[PDB]
Each structure stands twice: as C-alpha cells, then as structure tokens.
C-alpha cells in the first residue's frame, strides 16, 4: 500500500502536542515555552519529511492534491513557529497553538475520509 497510518499519526502527534502546549502555557515558564516551540517544529518538520516521501508515493494526483496541500501548510505553520523563535507574547504563543490545532484537525478530518 501507499501507507497512511503513519501520517495520521504524524498528524496526532502535534495535535497532542498543541494540545499539550496550550496547558503548559498557562503553567507560565519561558524554558518550558521555548522547549514546547521546539517540540511543535520538530514534529512539524518531520511530518513534511514524510509527507514529501508519500507525496511521490502517491497513487492517484487526486490524492497527491490532498497530500501536496498538506505539505505546504505544515511548511507554513513551521514558518510561523520560526518567528516565535524571534520574539512573541504568552497571550499570542497560546493563541498560535490553538490555531495551529484547528489546522491540524481539518487535516485528519479530511484525510480520515478514505475515499
Ligand atoms: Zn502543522
Ligand atoms: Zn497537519
């Protein structure tokens, strides 16, 4: 097969993650805020490096369209992490999470849909 559990979970991953941020940031730390900005790229990161490889892996262009998409937003959510690395408030890094989350979430909705 193409493989796709792999990628969903990829996708769980950071959503458990942003998940996990979003408590965290009300713990209130800087190291920890820095160490979970880092943890949400790497997974990012990643999960591009896979995408990429599933993208050429991809049986129909159809379906390639849904993965190509994917692959550009994590890209962009990435980029914006990249400036939260630079600078940023507690109120807007939560809010980046919370946002970041609803993305994810459309992405496993729309690839949960085998059809
Ligand atoms: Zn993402
Ligand atoms: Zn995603």
């Known amino acids: 097969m193409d493989e796709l559990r792999e990628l969903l979970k990829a996708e769980q991953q950071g959503i458990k993650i942003l998940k ?5 940031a009300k713990e209130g730390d800087e190291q920890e805020l820095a160490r ?5 790229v790497k997974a ?3 999960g591009v490096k896979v995408y990429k490889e599933a993208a050429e892996k991809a049986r129909n262009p159809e379906k390639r369209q849904v993965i190509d998409k ?4 994590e890209e962009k959510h ?12 507690a109120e807007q890094f939560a809010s980046l999470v919370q946002q970041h989350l609803q993305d994810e979430q459309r992405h496993v909705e729309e690839i949960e849909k085998k059809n």
């Open 44 to 46: 990012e990161k990643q």
């Open 78 to 89: 990435i980029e914006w992490h990249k400036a939260a690395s630079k600078q940023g408030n």
């Open 70 to 73: 994917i692959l550009e937003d």
């Open 36 to 40: 979970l900005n880092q943890e949400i």
């Open 20 to 24: 996990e941020v979003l408590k965290k």
